[PDB]
Ligand binder design. Structure first.
Ligand SMILES: C[C@H](C[C@@H](C[C@H](C[C@@H](C[C@@H](CCN1CCCC1=O)N1CCCC1=O)N1CCCC1=O)N1CCCC1=O)N1CCCC1=O)N1CCCC1=O
Ligand SMILES: O=C1NCCc2cccc(c2)OC/C=C/COc2cccc(c2)-c2nc1c(O)c(=O)[nH]2
Ligand SMILES: [Mn+2]
Ligand SMILES: [Mn+2]
Length: 178
């Protein structure tokens, strides 16, 4: 499906297997839903870079775990720190700022995606951080959590994936897909 071969050669093999394992958990096959396959791989890579931008063990990685296991660590964090349980599964937990982080990668307007995720999670205690393929970012209360250098690499990698999709003529089908 062309997009499938590009995903396997663009993303780290463990990230590709994680997106496959996550898609098959929700009854989706990455061989047909190739645009969703590239989006989950991109979201998985950004989340792993985000947690890497911290300090040693600043973040608790929620994304990439099984649906049952991810909710298990979420319950453990809520029952040890005391934060409110979120209605939807977040991506990380900031042990420094004591809040869950929700990371999104957009292809449309970066200003729009926040409006979608803000009106979804009623628990306003959890943070929200959107990255864009054009190099923009938007976080809750202007608290961008990470250092400027850590976020700049995520934007750079996001634009690199954009150029590779357009170079093989799949960016338009992937951008006009969410
Ligand atoms: C812990 C383990 C897997 C981790 C996933 C994540 C991958 C990490 C790998 C590092 C090294 N880098 C960086 C350079 C290339 C590379 O290889 N990064 C971060 C950047 C991209 C990447 O690949 N991390 C973080 C801790 C060590 C590790 O490997 N995950 C998966 C979800 C939860 C989690 O912590 N786990 C945990 C149990 C199941 C499993 O597989
Ligand atoms: O937490 C998340 N978990 C996604 C795990 C998953 C895998 C397959 C199917 C799913 C769930 O069913 C629910 C979603 C179905 C639409 O597939 C896409 C496509 C592109 C991005 C995302 C989801 C996306 N997933 C999350 C985010 O937090 C996020 O910001 N974006
Ligand atoms: Mn998630
Ligand atoms: Mn997310």
């Amino acid at each position: 499906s062309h997009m499938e071969d590009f995903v396997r050669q663009c993303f780290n093999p463990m990230i590709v297997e994680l997106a496959e394992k996550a898609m098959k958990e929700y009854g989706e096959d990455p061989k047909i839903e190739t645009n969703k396959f590239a989006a989950i791989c991109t979201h998985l890579e950004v989340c792993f870079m985000y947690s890497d931008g911290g300090s040693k063990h600043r973040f608790e990685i929620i994304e990439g775990r099984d649906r049952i296991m991810a909710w298990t660590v979420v319950n453990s964090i809520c029952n040890t720190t005391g934060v409110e349980k979120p209605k939807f599964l977040p991506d990380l937990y900031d042990y420094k700022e004591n809040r869950f982080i929700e990371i999104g990668v957009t292809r449309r307007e970066v200003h729009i995606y926040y409006l979608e995720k803000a009106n979804k999670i009623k628990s306003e205690k959890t943070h929200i951080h959107i990255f864009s393929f054009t190099g923009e970012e938007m976080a809750t209360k202007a608290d961008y959590t990470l250092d400027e250098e850590s976020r700049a690499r995520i934007k750079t990698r996001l634009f690199t994936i954009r150029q590779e999709m357009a170079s093989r003529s799949l960016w338009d089908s992937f951008r006009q897909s969410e």
